[PDB]
Amino acid sequence: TTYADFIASGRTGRRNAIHD
Amino acid sequence: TTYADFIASGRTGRRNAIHD
Amino acid sequence: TTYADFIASGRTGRRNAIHD
Amino acid sequence: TTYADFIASGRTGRRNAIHD
Amino acid sequence: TTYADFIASGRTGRRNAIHD
Amino acid sequence: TTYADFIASGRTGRRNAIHD
Amino acid sequence: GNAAAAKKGSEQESVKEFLAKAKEDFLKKWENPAQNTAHLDQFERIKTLGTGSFGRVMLVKHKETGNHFAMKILDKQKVVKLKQIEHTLNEKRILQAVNFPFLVKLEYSFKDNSNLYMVMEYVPGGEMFSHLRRIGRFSEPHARFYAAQIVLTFEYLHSLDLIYRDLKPENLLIDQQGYIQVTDFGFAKRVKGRTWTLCGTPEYLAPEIILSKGYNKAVDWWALGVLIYEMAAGYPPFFADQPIQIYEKIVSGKVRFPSHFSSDLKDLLRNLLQVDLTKRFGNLKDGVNDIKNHKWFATTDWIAIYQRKVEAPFIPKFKGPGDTSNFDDYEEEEIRVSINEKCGKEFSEF
Amino acid sequence: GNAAAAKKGSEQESVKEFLAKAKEDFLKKWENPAQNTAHLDQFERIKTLGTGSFGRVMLVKHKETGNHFAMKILDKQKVVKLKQIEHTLNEKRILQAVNFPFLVKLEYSFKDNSNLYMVMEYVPGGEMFSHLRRIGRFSEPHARFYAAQIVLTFEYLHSLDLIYRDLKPENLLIDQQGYIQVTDFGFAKRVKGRTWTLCGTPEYLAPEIILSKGYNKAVDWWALGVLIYEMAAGYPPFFADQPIQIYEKIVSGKVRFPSHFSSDLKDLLRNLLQVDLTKRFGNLKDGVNDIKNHKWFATTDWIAIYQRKVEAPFIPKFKGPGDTSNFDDYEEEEIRVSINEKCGKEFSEF
Amino acid sequence: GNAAAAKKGSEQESVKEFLAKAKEDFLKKWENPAQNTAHLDQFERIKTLGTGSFGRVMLVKHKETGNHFAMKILDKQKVVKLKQIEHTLNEKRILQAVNFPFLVKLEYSFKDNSNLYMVMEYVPGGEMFSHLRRIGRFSEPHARFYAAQIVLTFEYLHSLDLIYRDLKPENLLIDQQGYIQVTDFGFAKRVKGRTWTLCGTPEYLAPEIILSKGYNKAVDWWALGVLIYEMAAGYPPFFADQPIQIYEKIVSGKVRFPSHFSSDLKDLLRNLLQVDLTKRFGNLKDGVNDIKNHKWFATTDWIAIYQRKVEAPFIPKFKGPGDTSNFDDYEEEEIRVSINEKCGKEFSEF
Amino acid sequence: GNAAAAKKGSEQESVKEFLAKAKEDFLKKWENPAQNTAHLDQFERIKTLGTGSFGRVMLVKHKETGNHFAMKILDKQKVVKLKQIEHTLNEKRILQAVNFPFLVKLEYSFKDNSNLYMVMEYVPGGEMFSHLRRIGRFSEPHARFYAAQIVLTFEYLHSLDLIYRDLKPENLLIDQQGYIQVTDFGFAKRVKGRTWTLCGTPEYLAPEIILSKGYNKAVDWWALGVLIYEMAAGYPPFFADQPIQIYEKIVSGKVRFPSHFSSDLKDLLRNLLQVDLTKRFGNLKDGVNDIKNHKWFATTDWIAIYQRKVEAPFIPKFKGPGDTSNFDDYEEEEIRVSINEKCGKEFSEF
Amino acid sequence: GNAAAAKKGSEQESVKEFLAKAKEDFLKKWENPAQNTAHLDQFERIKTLGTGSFGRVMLVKHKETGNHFAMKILDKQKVVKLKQIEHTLNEKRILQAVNFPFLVKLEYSFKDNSNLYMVMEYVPGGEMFSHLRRIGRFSEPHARFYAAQIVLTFEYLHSLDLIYRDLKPENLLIDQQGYIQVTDFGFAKRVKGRTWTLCGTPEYLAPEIILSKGYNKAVDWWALGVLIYEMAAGYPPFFADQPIQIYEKIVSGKVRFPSHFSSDLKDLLRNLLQVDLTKRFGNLKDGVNDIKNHKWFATTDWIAIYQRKVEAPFIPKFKGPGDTSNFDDYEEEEIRVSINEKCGKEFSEF
Ligand SMILES: *C(=O)CCCCCCCCCCCCC
Ligand SMILES: *C(=O)CCCCCCCCCCCCC
Numbered sequence A, B, C, D, E, F: 001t002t003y004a005d006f007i008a009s010g011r012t013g014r015r016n017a018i019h020d
Numbered sequence G, H, I, J, K: 001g002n003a004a005a006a007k008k009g010s011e012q013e014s015v016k017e018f019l020a021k022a023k024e025d026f027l028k029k030w031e032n033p034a035q036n037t038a039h040l041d042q043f044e045r046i047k048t049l050g051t052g053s054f055g056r057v058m059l060v061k062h063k064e065t066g067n068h069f070a071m072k073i074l075d076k077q078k079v080v081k082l083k084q085i086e087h088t089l090n091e092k093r094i095l096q097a098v099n100f101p102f103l104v105k106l107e108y109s110f111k112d113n114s115n116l117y118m119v120m121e122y123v124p125g126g127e128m129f130s131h132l133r134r135i136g137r138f139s140e141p142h143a144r145f146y147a148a149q150i151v152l153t154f155e156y157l158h159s160l161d162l163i164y165r166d167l168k169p170e171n172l173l174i175d176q177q178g179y180i181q182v183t184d185f186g187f188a189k190r191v192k193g194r195t196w197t198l199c200g201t202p203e204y205l206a207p208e209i210i211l212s213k214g215y216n217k218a219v220d221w222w223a224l225g226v227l228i229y230e231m232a233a234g235y236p237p238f239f240a241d242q243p244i245q246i247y248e249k250i251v252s253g254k255v256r257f258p259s260h261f262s263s264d265l266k267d268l269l270r271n272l273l274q275v276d277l278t279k280r281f282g283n284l285k286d287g288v289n290d291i292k293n294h295k296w297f298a299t300t301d302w303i304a305i306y307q308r309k310v311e312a313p314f315i316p317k318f319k320g321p322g323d324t325s326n327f328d329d330y331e332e333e334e335i336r337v338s339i340n341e342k343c344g345k346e347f348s349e350f
């Protein structure tokens, strides 16, 4: 299980879009 | 209330340290 | 929001019927 | 148990004061 | 209510099969 | 973890006393 | 259907015949009432479910069937002194005459020297009222499920020339399956035309009742508006501390809808909480079908709901095997019935 | 101490001096009142916290300190017409004169052409009332924590010759830390001796008040009995639908204690819900110490509780950063104050 | 349909053909068994899901498909010494021969020197048992959903001349979608006619089994009665501390139904927990259709349930991505298989 | 139907005509845009719902209808400096041209000296995102409900030659009834054929976008794979701390499926998270019907879902009557619009 | 103190005198038993709290005090036939002789023609057992609170030459305040020295009991090890399906500690679940003080716990005013006592 990895990245919050 | 602002940033997840 | 008004009246309990 | 009586009266909400 | 009886027997856990 | 073993025995309910 | 296809055609064809068989039938029981259907030794008393002004409601077990009912016991003297003789008599007649999925069933009725007994089906989930107050507000799907059931209940009652006159969450009992059962037919009236009595709960009074101008079955569609609003909002559209202030507000009819109300919900409500009866839904040309075919009801199949075959949003799981805990572990009384028959000629028609 | 050791000796030595410094002090502010301590431009209005009979309560931010208060705004005309001039005036005097951990603090007071403003400390956790009704009943440790705080509040109030006259959960606000703060000193009276006014909430009326025989500070220890009972039980000892029936029951004083009440809890309650004032606790020879040294209170250190240093069973976490949601997103008004000063001589002493 | 219309006609027309294609089919696999369908290197071992009397259940990943199964591993010697050779052999034959939505699928089977391996589909939601015990009791809609699925499972099994002999919550696994999957076909027997073995769990024994008089497929409809009762009630109809006392009670058959059981539920149960087999539902003239057309089942469309297209009341969300936590973080073993083939001729037919 | 019967035939017959009426229609609005449909005085401002890079979203009440909308206000200067003129202009055109159950509706649009205003329908339940993160993961029935709705949304968008380019939980708003509404059409492009822009959120980028090779509508079916996986699993298939590492992983495409994923779910996902576009579902010969007729979708009736007549697994009940609490009690601003018209010719087409 | 300072000195000085006054006292009641303290008419029967092998436990209200007790009723004939005469007689003697905060109090005892009645204090929170099984496991602070109370209970019992012989969660009732009360003194023995009976629950048997070698008070410190482990872990250290396998494991004594056990908890447990009695804590030179002064107990003040003045982690709030629901709404019996005195000389000493 990578879910524990998941929580540890900052990427558990609102992801924005690279862009345009 | 800025709490709604808070949730909307990606900064609701694990914050790492600039660095070194 | 009147909901706060609502809670403050005694009329949050069982309402009976005027009557007959 | 009168608690069932209790719920059935309207007096389960905010009680005001007779008065003055 | 026998439910109170129920809880008090050890037979609230996994029941196996007499057998064979 | 034996806890999964635990749940699977019938011995998760009220234990009585061998006896006397 | 609700609108299956143009099977809406079969919906309506069917509703039509159904309701015709229904008048025939009610009229027979109405005009020739069934009377005194059983006696007290037939029932084991389990517990007191509640206690009122004319007496107790008891959980009882009918000894032949092994089935449970709720027994409302009324002391004749108490009803006589409380001047409730005609309300009592009227509730019983209505109740033994009527037959619909969502009305609570009067299983047996009898009197004895002291007391009148109306044995009803036991609906353990309780009233919608407390569930509503513990949960806070109901999602527009949950709230529409119940709305659909009451529309049908009122279509039927009104065809039998019966204005219910007392809608609110406290008379809507939720059963085993999650469907409504309406209780309390003590203010219902079989009135063709118009009547004048001040009756209901303040919150749910339609402006005409308050105004003493005479009123008709259109009061029940105004109370469906008050009901959908309190289910979908948490609180009534007009409420105040003093009833006269609730009235104050009702006869102005200025309602503010919650922002989470859908544009669609708001607009059903704008025509049920109508003050002009020439614009109130259910009271126009298109009767109920103005309500039944509103876009809030768009996903409702009226036959599925009648047929009890939709899946219920919420089923109450009241706790306590046999005797419950909420229902209540009261101090148990005797039911005493006397050596003499009290009030014989007043309750003679019961 | 509560009874540290025979450091109970130091408890009492200390209580004694404390209360002496306290009379000196109250008497000065009582007899020479502080008056008109600020003005409206000093405060940013955040939201309406509530709305009453004499006007709104508002969440306000004092601009120099960046601190939050709750502003009760009273329209002079409205208080004058509601004949509340003397209750208003009296509440303010009491409030600016008194000083204890558990009383809510009147931070500033001023009037202006239209309105009187009593700016109090903001206690966001709300009343004990709703928490109590959502939770259902409180464990005898939780319920004793609060009891301990009110005993101390009444020991102090009564030494200043003040009978509170309005205890119930709705005036007991729970703060940030989990301690009580009593609000509403509008029925308190500084009375040495006996008085005659009918005042309180029905449920909490002591039999003497109902009986119109004259009464004294002993009414507040009967209302502590009603309070501990409703906290530890869920519901009041005497309640009914009609107030006159509540009274009916109170002047008989026949209470049934819940089976989960401890033998010990029941016996504290038997002498606070006493009808004979010659047997009512807090009204005997041993004053409060009959209450303070009851075995239900046995594990309570009275100085620890005063000192706010016990750990609170429950701290409310009302939701909504800044503005909340429960407090409420109301329709915001103007506060209009007029070109002319209304009611000047009536509120002149304010 | 369930009774779509007189499309009940198509329901039955269809059931009829379905079951005919089904016997043809079973009989072929039954009479010519599929055998040794794979080998151990084909599977990555993830974790031990559990541990038994003949060995472990393991979560395994089949390397070609990237799919997960639960591998029951049985040590030949252990099954031989526990005298389980014929139960083992029989379970496998039944299992590789049968095919229904609600039976758990035996995906592959093979042996090797030491162990027999039955690789089944992994159903992560677990047994109904624990969910039932954590939730307490199931609403009659939830409980009927499951009932509907077992009626269909038994209609099919019994047509293939298979009496299941072991119904209870612990063999009813709830899958991803919320539907039942029955496990454990170790006491099932293909018996045309009557048999004599004492087998099941005490609670669920039909009076005939206890009485040693010979018995047939009618034992499984008595165990559907025990099952609907424990789902809708919390606890079994007959339970005791000692099994012989459970038996004591079963052969009297005196059941008390909970007051929240619907009149309708009680009456389905009165004819499934029947002691006279001439009155037991599912064993009369009208076979299953006496059960399938009972008013408790009135809102059930039997084809919708078969088709898995009803919406499930509850879907378990067991926690722990990959490896779970409940399933369990055990001490991992080796699976050792030997240099020599143990028990070759006993397990030769496997 | 979904596959009613060979009423699948009518499903497809119907889908076919539907989509034809749809192109006709879009093409008209697309090629002749509706423009400047209202003005600011028509709306009461209730509260700030949020605040962005080009400005605020506000809860507003349209004064004629008494209906609530969410007003996105964009300062022309800010969009001009942020170089968002063409994205803004493009989003508006798309939005006023398109019409489907599950897309959020642009109710009115207008500019004024300072700001552009896009008034949309208010969907109070919020994004799927936070619900998903509070709940953790969604059951495959819950997750399939939403999948079904997006398949239909993409079938329609792609027929109008629109590649959405920004799927993730944060643009999927859940309404009153429990159905999806897709927001943010700022990266959608009407492209027949292939395009080259780097756009989306890293997690959801299809390997072709990352590779800069040119790409088409097949990117949205790869993002449906990322979406079903994160709904049914909790977390994305490829995620990392740094975006370039997420990319790292995406262009290898090595996904590990959770053990609680059904064999069936895993296999839908194996062909949506396909790297070879010659094997990616939705991009083969059988278009969407390769997705729509996958066994994970087997119990889905596509017309029922379109018709909004399925019962929704979860309906959000955001708290706070009028103004909420989560939405937020912000510090309210003025909306200032200037004495002069800023950026006139850039936003001239709006 | 626990170790206040070298006020540990006063702790021990005090414990010392306390226990001396305690032997004096027990010895008097032990050697001259109090006998037949009341009669049945003194008590109103409220409800059946439970039902056993020798009869019912009832909630009763003592009519003079208005206090509630739990009445264990034992039918003399049943105890005589179950050969429980001496266990019964012994439990009563012990119970009327002993006096500690944490032992449940035998309030009155009497017999009558049929039955023996032991009226105990009513502790409504129930056993620790079910709470433990619903909560799952207890935090090492919660679990240490209870440990502290049992250490003290055993220090006292053992000084009176009483080996308890039956520790487990099912005899540890949690009261109103959140403190333990130990029930069931039917296997306790006053033994100076060593004894030989096989008694307890399998899980909690110390290896010596199983081995039949003779045993002493050191068995109760091995059962404190089993208890702290099951509180802090969820499940017992040695458990199996069959008791003989539990024994199997106990006489090897190979325990695996959970990873969330603190190094400190593990090491207290290593010397209470000691197999060598020359190394078992509580059985070495330093008696209990080896346990009482272990670093897991480091933050425990033993006098505070005795004094009941620590704040309890958890207080049960069993539901149901008067009569509860869990306790149970049973079918109420008569208590029949006969025209003749049954078993007179056997129970003569009672
Ligand atoms: C439309 O689907 C099929 C019509 C079958 C419906 C049965 C008719 C039941 C109508 C009774 C309605 C009761 C409301 C007062
Ligand atoms: C006993 O521990 C130490 C005494 C120190 C206590 C401080 C005195 C505070 C007394 C005020 C009591 C207020 C109640 C009306």
Ligand SMILES: *C(=O)CCCCCCCCCCCCC
Pocket: I001, I002, I004, I007, I008, I010, I011, I014, I015, I018, I151, I152, I153, I154, I155, I156, I303, I306
């Ligand atoms: C009635 O609606 C339509 C008939 C289509 C039903 C498909 C037949 C499936 C029958 C299998 C039943 C299995 C139970 C043992």
Ligand SMILES: *C(=O)CCCCCCCCCCCCC
Pocket: J001, J002, J004, J007, J008, J010, J011, J014, J015, J018, J151, J152, J153, J154, J155, J156, J303, J306
């Ligand atoms: C099949 O049941 C009956 C066909 C009726 C379906 C109505 C057609 C709606 C199709 C629109 C699909 C939209 C997806 C892009």
Ligand SMILES: *C(=O)CCCCCCCCCCCCC
Pocket: K001, K002, K004, K007, K008, K010, K011, K014, K015, K018, K151, K152, K153, K154, K155, K156, K303, K306
């Ligand atoms: C240390 O703080 C102060 C000593 C006062 C403690 C009172 C003594 C009570 C000892 C009884 C212990 C009971 C355990 C068997």
